[PDB]
């Protein structure tokens, strides 16, 4: 008898950051939202305000980051911060930015996991919708791949392939089956990670402005330069689960079934949506008014 609920946000939550890409500073507030409202950024600097709704149709450019648009106005690095929405469940939330993109705060998930943790969470009065995966949806460029496979719950499956001495042995693929695994534990503090000799090209064309070993792991060709290292053996992949989580919250709801990647990034993480979206027989909307019933579990808000 007790459903799975929508949830939103308790209490208005602020924080301050610099965007990784750009370097500008930037005032980020996430507000309560009504049932059906999804994720929705707005840039309160424009005159009028425009609101992006946090969704596949409107993703612009996947070129390092996910890049929302609408018109000429962008919303920049929405990964991480959709990331610990979907990890913690909200479904509906205003997403007030005073700047072109999200901060990029210590290059992971965790202070957004914290910071809505700490506003808390508000069950409203409206069945969570989910997306459950009925047929395989693949893409693939290159030796790229992203597929969707049905299963009874929520997984990720990702591997990354670089050829490097740090980038060695099993830490190139990791799973993780959200039924048994914490996304707060295991997966919202692997940072973002770039490599010196990438970063030096971006510096010489006044891109990646805001990144730094404070937001970022920087590795060279040989070492992690970060001085206090790793926060889990395989944090790279695991950054890529967490960027794959929060570019797949852009379908608006949850999904039931399991997410493979292959070397895949923003842009083909968006194409597998697209496809997916476009291929209807493949997925259905589904609810659950008895959680004893659900392959997804959450936390208690
Ligand atoms: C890991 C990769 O998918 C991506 N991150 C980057 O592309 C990236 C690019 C540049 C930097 C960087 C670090 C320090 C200084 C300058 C740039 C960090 C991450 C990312 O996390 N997207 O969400
Ligand atoms: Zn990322």
């Not at 005073?98 to 700490?118: K, R, T």
Request: net charge negative; proline share 3%.
């Amino acid at each position: 008898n007790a459903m799975i609920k929508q949830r939103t946000l308790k209490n208005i939550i602020r924080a301050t950051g610099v965007g990784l890409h750009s370097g500008e500073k930037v005032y980020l507030t996430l507000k309560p939202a009504p049932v059906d409202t999804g994720i929705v950024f707005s840039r309160t600097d424009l005159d009028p305000v425009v609101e992006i709704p946090a969704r596949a149709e409107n993703v612009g450019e996947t070129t390092m980051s996910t890049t929302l648009v609408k018109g000429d106005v962008k919303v920049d690095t929405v990964e991480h911060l959709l990331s610990a929405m979907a990890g913690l469940g909200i479904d509906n939330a205003y997403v007030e930015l005073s700047a072109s993109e999200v901060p990029i705060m210590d290059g992971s998930a965790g202070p957004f996991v914290f910071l809505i943790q700490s506003a808390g969470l508000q069950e409203q009065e409206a069945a969570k919708k989910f997306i459950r995966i009925k047929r395989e949806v693949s893409v693939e460029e290159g030796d790229k791949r992203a597929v969707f496979v049905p299963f009874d719950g929520f997984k990720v499956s990702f591997e990354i392939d670089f050829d490097h001495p740090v980038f060695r042995g099993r830490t190139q693929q990791a799973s993780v089956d959200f039924s048994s695994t914490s996304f707060v534990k295991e997966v919202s503090r692997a940072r973002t990670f770039g490599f010196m000799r990438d970063i030096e090209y971006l510096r010489s064309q006044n891109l990646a402005l805001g990144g730094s070993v404070e937001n970022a792991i920087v590795v060279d060709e040989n070492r992690v330069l970060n001085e206090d290292g790793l926060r889990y053996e395989d944090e790279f992949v695991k950054h890529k689960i967490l960027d794959a989580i929060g570019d797949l919250y852009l379908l608006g709801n949850s999904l039931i079934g399991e997410f493979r990647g292959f070397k895949s990034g923003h842009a083909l993480n968006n194409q597998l949506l697209r496809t997916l979206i476009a291929d209807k027989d493949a997925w259905e909307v589904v609810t659950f008014e008895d959680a004893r019933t659900a392959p997804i579990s959450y936390m208690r808000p």
